[PDB]
Design an enzyme around this catalytic site. Sequence first.
Site, PDB file in Angstrom:
ATOM      1  N   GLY D  29      -7.392  22.654 -33.773  1.00  0.00           N
ATOM      2  CA  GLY D  29      -8.091  21.579 -34.403  1.00  0.00           C
ATOM      3  C   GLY D  29      -9.408  21.301 -33.732  1.00  0.00           C
ATOM      4  CB  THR D  30     -12.357  19.052 -34.880  1.00  0.00           C
ATOM      5  OG1 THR D  30     -11.905  17.748 -35.080  1.00  0.00           O
ATOM      6  CG2 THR D  30     -12.423  19.778 -36.237  1.00  0.00           C
ATOM      7  CB  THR D  31     -14.004  18.365 -30.041  1.00  0.00           C
ATOM      8  OG1 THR D  31     -14.291  19.758 -29.822  1.00  0.00           O
ATOM      9  CG2 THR D  31     -13.848  17.693 -28.649  1.00  0.00           C
TER      10      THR D  31
END
Lengths: 241, 149, 244, 243, 250, 71
Positions: D29-31
């Site tokens: 997933g994204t930061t």
Amino acid sequence: GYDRHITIFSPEGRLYQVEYAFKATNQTNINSLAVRGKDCTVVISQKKVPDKLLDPTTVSYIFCISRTIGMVVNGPIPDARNAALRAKAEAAEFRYKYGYDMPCDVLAKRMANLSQIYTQRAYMRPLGVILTFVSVDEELGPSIYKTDPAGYYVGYKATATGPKQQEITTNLENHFKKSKIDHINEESWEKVVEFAITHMIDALGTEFSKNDLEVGVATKDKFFTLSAENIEERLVAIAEQ
Amino acid sequence: MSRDAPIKADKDYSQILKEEFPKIDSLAQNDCNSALDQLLVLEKKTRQASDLASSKEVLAKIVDLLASRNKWDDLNEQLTLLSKKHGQLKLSIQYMIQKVMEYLKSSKSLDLNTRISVIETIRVVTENKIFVEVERARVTKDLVEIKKE
Amino acid sequence: GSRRYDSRTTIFSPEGRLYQVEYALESISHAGTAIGIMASDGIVLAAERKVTSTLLEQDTSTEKLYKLNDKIAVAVAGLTADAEILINTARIHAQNYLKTYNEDIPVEILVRRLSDIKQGYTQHGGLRPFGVSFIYAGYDDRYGYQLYTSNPSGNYTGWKAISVGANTSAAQTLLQMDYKDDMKVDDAIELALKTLSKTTDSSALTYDRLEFATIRKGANDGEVYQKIFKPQEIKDILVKTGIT
Amino acid sequence: TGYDLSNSVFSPDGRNFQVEYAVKAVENGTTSIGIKCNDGVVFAVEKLITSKLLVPQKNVKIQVVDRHIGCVYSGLIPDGRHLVNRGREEAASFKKLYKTPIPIPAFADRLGQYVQAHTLYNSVRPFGVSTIFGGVDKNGAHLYMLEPSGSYWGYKGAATGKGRQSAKAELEKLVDHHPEGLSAREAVKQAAKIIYLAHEDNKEKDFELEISWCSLSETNGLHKFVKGDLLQEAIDFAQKEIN
Amino acid sequence: MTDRYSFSLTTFSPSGKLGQIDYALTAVKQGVTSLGIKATNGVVIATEKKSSSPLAMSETLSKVSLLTPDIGAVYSGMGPDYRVLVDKSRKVAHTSYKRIYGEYPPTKLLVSEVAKIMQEATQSGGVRPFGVSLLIAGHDEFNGFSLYQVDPSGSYFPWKATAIGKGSVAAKTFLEKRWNDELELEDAIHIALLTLKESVEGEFNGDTIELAIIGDENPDLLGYTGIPTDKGPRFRKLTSQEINDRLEAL
Amino acid sequence: SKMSLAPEADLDSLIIRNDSLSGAVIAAIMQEAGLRAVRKNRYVILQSDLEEAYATQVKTDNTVDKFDFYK
């Protein structure tokens, strides 16, 4: 084959889920030491060196169950939170129905019944934590009861849990049998703390600092941790000695 | 321990109180136990490296008394208490203490002293398992000399 | 976890004969022999115990012949635990019918309902079915004595002689040669004890490994009397017949 | 072998292997970062612009709980939304009983029970999401992270997603240089910096910076998004720093 | 959320006889030794009770538990299974028992209730059988002293003497000879302790050895002597000193 | 017979410590004991040595595993 895999009685009759659970405690690598004071129950434990991401002052091992019972949990960090609910909730239960909080012995009996149930259904599994309830009961005086994932339990004069529990036992064995005392007969509770820390440093071989510590003292009609100021003040007396 | 201000801080502290060593020495002339008391605080350094610095001062002291017969008892008795209790491990500061232990053994100064000293000295190093046994055995041989008679 | 795994006993078998029910008949034949011999004037009912352990107080503990009520006695062969539940269920059923209608339940009705419960288990119960056969020795005025046996299948069949438990064939064969239609209860007492001894590997089948009961209308003033015979009364009639 | 497959059965090491599978989504997933500051908490989340079909400022993962707790998450997107709902349910129930906002410590405790519950069921799968949550309340600023496996701790700084490696290595040095903490305002600029180091990792697609905050002094202990002039300067200035 | 099982996990083996009943039984055999002699004026029940860890309190560990003030019980097998089964058995007896009778349950009756419960565990999907054997020793008017043995299969029979656990084979044979029709309360205890020594040698402190009798009635123990025609507790849990005493008169 | 037992304590000491063990174990005991005897430079096997060798070999799945679910 199959029998072994899921919960149900193996041919041998072994419960494999339980055996694995005992390995599971050691994987957190937490070590504990608890002794009986004269009028206090001192339990001390390690806590792994803090990260700069974490807050070093936070704790999550100690949980105040009730005024009488404090509890320190050794085993899976996520499951310790799960277990903490059930102890407080049944603690309050006894206040409504029977009109006061559970004793130490009586809370252990209740958790043990619950543990047994969790093992039979498939869906439910035993809590992989080992729970150390500390209390000073009035009738029994200073008391420690150790309750196991199995649903097995027994009181202790002094107890140890973890991979290096082996070293602590040998130290406490030396401490308490030779003297011939069932518990420490020192009246001041402060000198019970002084001294339980001393045995921890000796036995595992590694010195403790404020950051690893965390001092739990339970007394008649109270469970308290020591302030950070006091933790440091016990250190000055320990070094001179 | 984890704290790293002690390392510098303590090295500095030892050096300034080593320039105060003759002051301690004059007070030692009047009362050894009082000069001893100042040094006790000093050899409770928490860090090992600065312990080594500080243990030099203790070595110098007993030479000037040359040699005590009541104050040296407290000193023998203490070293025992430091190592058995903690010492922060039984080996950690106990190498530092070895140079302190060494001086009784090799001093060999007065026949009066020699008889008395061996019974007290071997008692201390007994239950330790480092170099001390090599020393301990040799001084034992000195009582055998007396026992021959 | 539970979705993956299956222990469905509710598959419609491809042979027309459910496999679990097959194995429960095996298990019945391990348990001792019980024999129902129907005579015009009664049912002579006799079953050997399967324990033989000496420390075990067999004397006191009846474990096969249980009196349900005045006219109906059951002999058990099969799993004793499974059996206990069906004994309480059979006792309460006869009482409830007696209360509603003021007549002792006809034999037919009682046996049918109990068989239908066993059936139910594999019909869609999900349950393993009880691995017990019961000989229900019963009386009612209309139909005389009536003799029926049950199966783990939930099927009952009437008979004039039946055997369950061990040595089904050995017992059945003797009774066919020796029992005649007209032999009375009196004969059947002598007949039962002797055939059992001959099937069993014991040199003499002792009184203490026996249980014996009769249901008879030859109890005066038009009445029905059962009596579970006590171990020592079995002993006197054991000596007469020369088994001992 | 078979113990692994069977959900909620002790692995022969200890603890069901499915809980470990779920962790892996969170890395992919994204930061998302959570910074504890003097005044309050500052949330930033990397919203990838895959395409220009996407609507600027409008694919927020920022979902308010009560009115003073921001919640933002990383990992499996549907799983989050269910746990998000769960937080809401919990907050309101406290207000039924006790007629006042939930404290942040109490929220951290009560959210954690829900994860454990499903993972002592074989029938109901693990959560596939780490949740960063926190706000300012009466008892002050507080930052918690609920790991996928269910653990809550205080944090000086928190990170999840692909670029947590970049995020962590900066936050350690930033706390070493500033042990007295830093204002939430300055940390608006410094959040922006941190996310830029993490977009080295997520360099495949362009991005859009979204900060939200809840601050004691400046949002008055309510939670609202950061936008307009505050947000613009944060973009402008941070850029220069990272060149 | 319930397990998606909808069927009995327990199946008949293809050779007859349930898999699981066999599986449960092994535990009773593996577990530590217990013995009992039924007697005419009492019942002696005896078990080994080894320290788990010397540091562990060896007094709080119990294997004797109360069902009624007249009837006590001891087991071999799984320890946690026992505890729960006792609690269920207090309710099954007491409340329901008081409603249909209002007394303490006779021994025969109490033992039969326990048998059904064991069966229902096994039959019920999602719930695996209780693998414990209990000896329920008790008193009733109508049968004098009685000892029943309750198997995990859900079957019971009464015995003159019985043993379960590892040492059962050795014990039963020793006892078999020593058992008499007329027995002294004192002799039943001597003979019991003598055999128990052979189960595991050493540790004959009366602390580590748990001994109880279903002795004679006491209005003393009852705690009211104002009418002493009331039955006292028949059951007595002996002290360590009492055991120490028995070793000298053996 | 093989080697006169030391007079440290009696012949009869060995006898008491074995309580039910078979010959095979007796042999493993005596084998270790005289090995350590050779180091001291006495060919007599000390009665202490047999004592230590006997004492050891206690392992054979302890009571911890058992007692958590069979006791």
